[PDB]
């Protein structure tokens, strides 16, 4: 309420050059960057990014039709999610060849204790191998369905984004 | 702006040689300590920006030994230059002989 | 008294720790089992979209308009 943290940067020592402004941390609803996997410190893969997958798949129903090859055509208005699954499955590899900037082999995880856990030092290396890779079970499971759920249903549009 | 007939390619390959030449140029005229400096000022930008924050990369992006930055000047070039005349000397003759 | 916030922004997400999760799932994942669905992954469409006629093409047949493979000469 009384002005705010303006000039004097990034929280702490006026010399740690990430940066503070709005579109860092703000009333107008930074809130975003904090319920999709974004910030928080959060919890437990799958139900973080099976959301990405879920969302991320159908997001491509676009440049998979009027863009590219056949606009509107035979075989046909299978548009929405063609090989659009097909031309995931590497997006569904890629980050399953990432597994090198995450390593451990198991996921406790999950609560937290008292005490605390997500212990007072997160920004960085909590996540693991058999510690991240089940987010990968999400996005892919989520990808498909993220694709496929846009197919079976609908295709002479409707009021879906109006805003929002 | 009609079609392609059977001499279609170098009509592509050629402009290839006529691209793939060309850009054996940046590497060449555009020397070394302009790349790092820059490729820092955003090797950096993508180290801040959330959502695509949890992504720290296995090793660490630098610009190119000045040799190289003269080599791949040479195998975009010549490759370009081996190209075209290459496709021309052939193109040419399947029309005229 | 507490000027709030977030800070602590909105309910810790839905009673949804279940079904997606676990269930199905291609999962466990990497190292071993990854290839396990990127082997089909890349020999799937491929393989089976390195055929299926007969057919589906761009389309054209029976070389004529003043015959062809001739003239005329013969069959």
């Amino acid at each position: 309420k009384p002005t705010y943290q303006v000039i004097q940067p990034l929280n702490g020592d006026p010399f740690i050059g990430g940066l503070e402004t709005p579109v860092t941390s703000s009333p107008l609803i930074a809130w975003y960057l904090s319920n999709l996997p974004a910030y928080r410190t959060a919890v437990n893969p799958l139900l973080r990014g099976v959301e990405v997958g879920l969302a991320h798949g159908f997001l491509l129903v676009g440049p998979f039709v009027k863009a590219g090859p056949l606009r509107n055509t035979e075989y046909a208005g299978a548009a929405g999610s063609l090989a659009a699954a097909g031309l995931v499955v590497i997006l569904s590899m890629c980050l399953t060849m990432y597994g090198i900037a995450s390593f451990k082999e198991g996921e406790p995880s999950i609560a937290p204790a008292l005490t605390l856990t997500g212990r007072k030092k997160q920004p960085d290396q909590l996540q693991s191998a058999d510690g991240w890779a089940k987010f990968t079970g999400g996005f892919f499971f989520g990808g498909v369905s993220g694709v496929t759920w846009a197919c079976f249903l609908m295709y002479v549009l409707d009021l879906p984004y109006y805003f929002k | 702006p009609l079609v392609c007939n059977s001499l279609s390619v170098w009509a592509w390959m050629f402009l290839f040689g006529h691209l793939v030449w060309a850009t054996g140029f940046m590497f060449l005229i555009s020397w070394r300590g302009y790349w790092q400096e820059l490729i820092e000022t955003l090797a950096w930008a993508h180290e801040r920006t959330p959502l695509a924050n949890l992504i720290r990369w296995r090793d660490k992006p630098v610009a190119l030994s000045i040799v190289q930055a003269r080599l791949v000047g040479l195998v975009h070039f010549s490759v370009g230059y081996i190209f075209t005349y290459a496709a021309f000397l052939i193109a040419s003759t399947s029309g005229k002989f | 008294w507490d000027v709030y916030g977030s800070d602590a922004p909105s309910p810790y997400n839905s009673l949804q720790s279940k079904f997606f999760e676990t269930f199905a799932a291609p999962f466990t994942k990497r190292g071993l089992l990854l290839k396990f669905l990127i082997l089909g992954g890349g020999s799937l469409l491929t393989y089976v979209s390195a055929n299926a006629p007969q057919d589906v093409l761009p389309i054209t047949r029976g070389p004529q308009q003043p015959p062809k493979l001739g003239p005329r000469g013969k069959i």
Binding site: - | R58, D59 | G42, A50, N51, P53, Q54
Partner: peptide, 30 residues
Amino acid sequence: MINLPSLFVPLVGLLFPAVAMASLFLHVEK
């Protein structure tokens, strides 16, 4: 039965190198 050899090309371009840039991804983490 018959029609192909496409079998090869979706490899030699599509999965094969998909597996080159895959397993020597590497050379590093070979």
